[PDB]
């Protein structure tokens, strides 16, 4: 029927899109990865030869450095750290900066995600619908001061998303001393609920305990961006669901 | 109105739930984090004292080890590695094992996620609806051999989810030599599109290039689990959206 053809076309398009993306990523990153591997191997060989580090103890050093990486950012299991971890868990971001080390903690986190994900999704959907209604009212009032079409709403939503992304990128560049492009990329990754973890905020000079205002601003910005993303998805994507 | 009260109640419940989760996580992880920090500090101090490593070169060693961590898993930017990265990107998992190092690569990844996320969502929704219809037909045929209620469908979906999770955990424990509980936790994290990245498959002894069958099985299991999760969300969660 129509549904079978539609889902077959969707699967074929997804597979072709995946193949194209894999080919492009390989062609763009193979040489860079090879050069980085060669340089890192040369540097580590030089350091090992200079310091005469034993081969057995090198693995211990690697394990210690890997395990102590989060601990270099301060205390990540305080009230602020636990709140940040819970926010990442409920939003399905998965930064990976801090992870539970106890089986009971892992089970509690699993139950927490199970009981919290649908609630967060419903709240975000309701907030996005309310924001869309408010934006429609504002646009109607502005047009009266100067009927609304779907293209106008789509353009307004896209402009709002771009403005929010630019504001977040500028704020993160000013705060964390990051590049504008890097801040924009990190903001896009955070707002898409992907969570690569390469760039994580509130991880410098113990900002989680000495800058409560910065933590509050980051939480508010994350919530606002998630609400805007949900509203945009409802406006453009949800119409094709049912 | 009703919508305002509903969204206010949702926000209040989410905030209370976040506070409770943060309190529990702190009370469960503070002592463990402190003990781990103390042990790691003692070990690193002992090693530095034994090897007389200069303070300036220790930072270089840490940076080299951190940058060379993915490269210890083999070549992560081959055809299989690029396909895995694209699959993680389109599914909003964000494992973080490999990340682009080029600005053009980052821009391409951003455009790729933007153009691929709604397509994957629509395909998963359609596949979940088809699976739900097939399960309903199978249940009707089984009952005839021996009307259907919503509670029966919910129970069947929960049992299917539990069985899929158990099968994936057993397979990953047999393949990656992981614990059953750890494999179950990793499978749950993967199927929830969270992506902590603490446990990543296809990262041992170059399995991405020497075990094509294992990679294919992992891809099929991930797709099946995502389809089952989408079907369950449509069955129980989507009814409260609109
Ligand atoms: C009307 C639209 C287009 C603009 C919206 C206003 C923004 C420009 C404001 C609103 C909230 C502000 C933020 C609120 C809180 C903070 C934390 C603040 O941090 C501190 O004061 C401690 C750290 C330090 O010492 O810098 C730095 C500024 C910042 C990011 C502010 C930057 C400017 C922001 C984004
Ligand atoms: C109607 C909506 C907009 C309400 C939003 C509520 C916010 C005003 C709350 C919710 C979470 C709160 C944050 C949750 C956790 C913390 C960590 C907390 O840190 C500590 O308690 C230790 C550091 C210190 O001693 O200050 C400081 C306040 C802060 C940033 C809170 C600031 C106020 C926040 C952003
Ligand atoms: C196995 C997993 C997927 C179960 C997930 C549980 C959900 C089915 C629950 C968890 C939170 C619940 C929500 C929590 C709070 C509210 C607000 C509540 O609003 C009111 O009570 C006031 C408005 C009115 O009068 O209806 C309506 C139900 C709702 C959306 C609930 C709907 C059902 C939800 C999503
Ligand atoms: C800025 C971002 C949010 C843009 C996202 C793009 C979407 C609006 C596009 C991308 C993939 C598209 C889908 C790709 C494939 C199909 C199958 C297609 O089915 C057919 O062609 C056969 C059935 C029929 O005859 O209609 C129907 C449209 C649909 C769902 C498309 C609907 C529009 C989608 C979701
Ligand atoms: C009807 C339901 C309850 C059971 C479904 C069947 C499973 C028990 C099968 C189906 C697919 C199978 C997997 C398909 C592919 C592989 C890869 C295979 O890897 C290799 O052959 C190379 C690595 C090695 O040398 O072990 C190991 C078995 C495994 C995980 C299989 C384990 C058993 C699985 C999960
Ligand atoms: C109707 C549905 C079920 C179709 C599903 C398609 C699968 C049968 C395809 C899609 C992606 C494929 C995989 C994509 C990438 C690779 C890496 C590829 O590795 C190499 O080319 C290098 C290693 C070598 O030399 O074998 C081996 C095949 C494999 C696992 C493929 C095996 C077959 C897969 C799982
Ligand atoms: K993630
Ligand atoms: K991650
Ligand atoms: K990570
Ligand atoms: K996600
Ligand atoms: K994620």
């Amino acid at each position: 029927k129509r549904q079978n053809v539609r889902t077959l076309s969707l699967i074929v398009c997804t597979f072709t899109y995946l193949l194209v993306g894999a080919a492009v990523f390989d062609a763009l990153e193979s040489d860079h990865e090879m050069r980085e591997e060669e340089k890192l191997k040369a540097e580590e060989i030089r350091i090992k030869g200079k310091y005469n580090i034993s081969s057995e103890d090198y693995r211990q050093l690697e394990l210690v450095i890997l395990q102590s990486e989060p601990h270099r950012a301060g205390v990540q299991w305080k009230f602020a750290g636990s709140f940040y971890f819970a926010i990442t868990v409920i939003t399905t971001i998965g930064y990976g900066h801090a992870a539970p080390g106890t089986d009971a903690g892992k089970a509690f986190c699993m139950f927490y995600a199970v009981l919290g994900i649908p609630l967060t999704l419903v709240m975000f959907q309701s907030l996005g619908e309310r924001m869309n209604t408010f934006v429609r009212y504002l646009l109607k009032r502005i047009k009266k001061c100067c009927d609304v079409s779907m293209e106008n709403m789509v353009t307004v939503g896209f402009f709002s998303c771009m403005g929010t992304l630019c504001i977040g990128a500028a704020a993160f560049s000013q705060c964390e001393e990051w590049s504008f492009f890097h801040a924009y990329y990190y903001c896009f990754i955070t707002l898409t609920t992907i969570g690569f973890g390469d760039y994580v905020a509130l991880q410098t000079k113990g900002a989680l305990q000495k800058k409560p205002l910065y933590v509050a601003f980051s939480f508010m910005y994350i919530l606002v961006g998630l609400t805007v993303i949900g509203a945009f998805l409802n406006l453009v994507v949800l119409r094709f669901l049912t």
Side-chain angles (χ1 to χ4, degrees), chain A residues 51-94:
Chain A
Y51 279 96
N52 202 358
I53 297 167
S54 178
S55 65
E56 187 179 2
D57 293 332
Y58 205 66
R59 299 173 65 249
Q60 194 155 106
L61 279 168
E62 290 180 5
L63 289 176
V64 161
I65 283 175
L66 285 185
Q67 288 183 238
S68 68
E69 194 195 342
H71 310 125
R72 298 269 81 82
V75 193
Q76 285 290 313
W77 284 117
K78 280 314 282 178
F79 187 69
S82 299
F83 210 81
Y84 194 74
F85 181 73
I87 282 182
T88 54
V89 159
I90 63 161
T91 55
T92 73
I93 289 178

Side-chain angles (χ1 to χ4, degrees), chain A residues 93-97 194-198:
Chain A
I93 289 178
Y95 271 133
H97 58 288
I194 293 176
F196 279 160
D198 46 354

Side-chain angles (χ1 to χ4, degrees), chain A residues 129-146:
Chain A
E129 196 60 80
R130 293 299 296 172
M131 178 174 174
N132 276 320
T133 303
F134 189 65
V135 164
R136 186 186 295 273
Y137 183 90
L138 286 186
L139 287 170
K140 183 180 179 180
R141 186 168 183 166
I142 287 171
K143 286 175 72 174
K144 181 181 178 181
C145 287
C146 291

Side-chain angles (χ1 to χ4, degrees), chain A residues 24-70:
Chain A
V24 174
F25 272 135
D26 196 342
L28 280 176
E29 302 276 338
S30 58
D31 189 70
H32 187 218
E33 187 208 7
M34 184 199 90
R35 291 197 277 100
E36 280 186 346
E37 286 174 352
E38 283 176 13
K39 290 202 290 182
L40 285 171
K41 189 177 294 295
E43 184 86 58
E44 75 178 1
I45 285 170
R46 177 181 80 76
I47 296 170
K48 190 181 291 184
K50 182 178 179 180
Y51 279 96
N52 202 358
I53 297 167
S54 178
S55 65
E56 187 179 2
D57 293 332
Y58 205 66
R59 299 173 65 249
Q60 194 155 106
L61 279 168
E62 290 180 5
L63 289 176
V64 161
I65 283 175
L66 285 185
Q67 288 183 238
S68 68
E69 194 195 342

